[PDB]
């Protein structure tokens, strides 16, 4: 239940992704869990809200993360790769230009099991999750944020 960044594991064991606990809600990407319930110790976390097009899901309650990239400043990916300590990677986002507006994007290419890692602004607020993107042959991830 504690606030923090978490590995999402499956059963030998494999890391399939990452997520964020905040205000009693667990946040990750839909393609990581496909909405399956999650075990945490002796307890169970049930899905509450999810959307395939946004590629997001929340457990135990509604999506809580609402900060947004300011469009000018560097950010940090708090990457939690399989088998590696959580680590911060600072970068200046580029931009996905879409018919519905601009989305920040980070041109960082980590293992697939890093999907769901949070991207932070300088205040430490989560401005979105890593792991839904496009290939340009380097991968570029949208900064994917939900609605609170």
């Amino acid at each position: 239940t504690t606030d923090g960044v978490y590995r999402v594991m499956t059963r030998g064991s494999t890391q399939v992704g990452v997520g964020v606990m905040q205000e009693g809600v667990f946040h990750t990407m839909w393609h990581v869990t496909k909405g399956a319930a999650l075990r945490s110790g002796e307890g169970r976390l049930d899905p509450y809200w999810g959307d395939v097009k946004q590629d997001l899901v929340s457990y135990c309650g509604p999506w809580k993360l609402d900060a947004a990239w300011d469009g000018l400043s560097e950010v940090q990916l708090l990457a939690v790769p399989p088998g590696e300590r959580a680590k911060n990677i600072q970068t200046l986002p580029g931009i996905f230009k879409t018919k519905d507006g601009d989305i920040g994007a980070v041109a960082l290419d980590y293992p697939a099991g890093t999907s769901g890692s949070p991207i932070l602004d300088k205040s430490g607020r989560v401005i979105g999750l890593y792991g839904n993107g496009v290939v340009i042959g380097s991968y570029v991830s949208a900064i994917t944020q939900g609605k609170r």
């Binding site: 606030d3 923090g4 960044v5 978490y6 590995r7 999402v8 594991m9 499956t10 059963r11 399939v16 990452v18 997520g19 964020v20 905040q22 839909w30 393609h31 869990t33 399956a36 999650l38 075990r39 945490s40 976390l45 395939v52 097009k53 946004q54 590629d55 940090q76 708090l78 939690v80 300590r85 959580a86 680590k87 911060n88 990677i89 600072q90 970068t91 200046l92 986002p93 580029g94 931009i95 996905f96 230009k97 879409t98 018919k99 994007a105 980070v106 041109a107 960082l108 932070l120 602004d121 300088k122 205040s123 430490g124 989560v126 839904n132 993107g133 496009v134 340009i136 570029v140 949208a142």
Partner: protein
Amino acid sequence: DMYIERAGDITWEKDAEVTGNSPRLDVALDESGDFSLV
């Protein structure tokens, strides 16, 4: 059996590695959540 394990606090780190470029890309997002270039 999908399960979670805590990996850290959510904090900015002053001593972070810095890397990566900042491309400007035209993209479309389809109903399946997939981005493609335009």
